[PDB]
Structures are given as structure tokens and as C-alpha cells.
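Closing statement on the zinc ion sub-project.
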Amino acid sequence: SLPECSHCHRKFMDVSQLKKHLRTHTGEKPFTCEICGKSFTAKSSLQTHIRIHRGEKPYSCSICGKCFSDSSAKRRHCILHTGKKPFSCPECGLQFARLDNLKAHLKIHSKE
DNA sequence: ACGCAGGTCCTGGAAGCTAA
DNA sequence: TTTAGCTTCCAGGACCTGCG
Ligand SMILES: [Zn+2]
Ligand SMILES: [Zn+2]
Ligand SMILES: [Zn+2]
Ligand SMILES: [Zn+2]
């Protein structure tokens, strides 16, 4: 009997996580950047965005040393040092390291 | 041309914490 | 002391972009 959203009927760990999810249906962004004025849905997104203004890149690759202000961009980059390409085109067989690029490569097949 | 990869921010579960 | 509900943190992903 986890807290269930009345709109989309999905459930969450506690009532505070549901209240945070309520904003995905309303579009409310209550965390505003003081520098540029852009607003964000979560405080952790605002803290990440502020590091862009200040040039703070604490996330660095242990293999090549490339630095990132965004922890997900660093996590996404470090995978490239493994060379894995787990996404294969169903039409031509071209393999991609990222699903975003196969999505784009399926468009060129759609327009043939 | 188009594969490649970084920029940016949204979403939610995990974990840590406060206060009822 | 307990623990519901709060804040923080982290992993993943969507969408965009410019480069070689
Ligand atoms: Zn909902
Ligand atoms: Zn800003
Ligand atoms: Zn690297
Ligand atoms: Zn293809």
C-alpha cells in the first residue's frame, strides 16, 4: 500500500516522494537559479546547474582525466573506455555505444 | 553526411535525517 | 525510542547540440 498518485496511479516510497512527483503533472519548478533566473524541478538539479556558472568540475575520469560538472556526463563518458556497443540496429546491424545515437540512426532508415 | 560524444536537465529510487 | 515523512544524494535517461 505505497502512496499512489491520483493522476497516473503510480506508487512511490513515501508521501514526500509522491509530493515531489506531483510536479511532473503540473510543471511547477520551485528551485530558481539566482544567477540566470532559470527554474528547476528539484534542488539537486539546481545545485548541478550552479556548478556550470562557477566552472566547478569535481567529476573527473579515472582513465583519461577528463573533468565534468555533471556526474552523469562523467559516468556516461567513462563507459567509452570499455568499447562496448550493446545497441544494434534492427535493420542494418550498425552497433552503437549509446541508445540516443541509434534512435537518431533509425530516423535515416525511416526516411530511407 | 552522419556517427560520435558532450551539454543540460528531468525522473525516481537509495540513503540519510528530523521531528512527530 | 520509534518511525513517518522529510531532505539529500545518486544513477539513469531524454533531448539537444556541435564537431570531425
Ligand atoms: Zn502522477
Ligand atoms: Zn543559472
Ligand atoms: Zn576518460
Ligand atoms: Zn541501421
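The pocket of zinc ion (ligand 4) is lined by residues A 89, 91-92, 94, 105, 109 (CB under 6 Å). With this model delivered, the sub-project is considered complete and its resources will be redirected to Aim 3.
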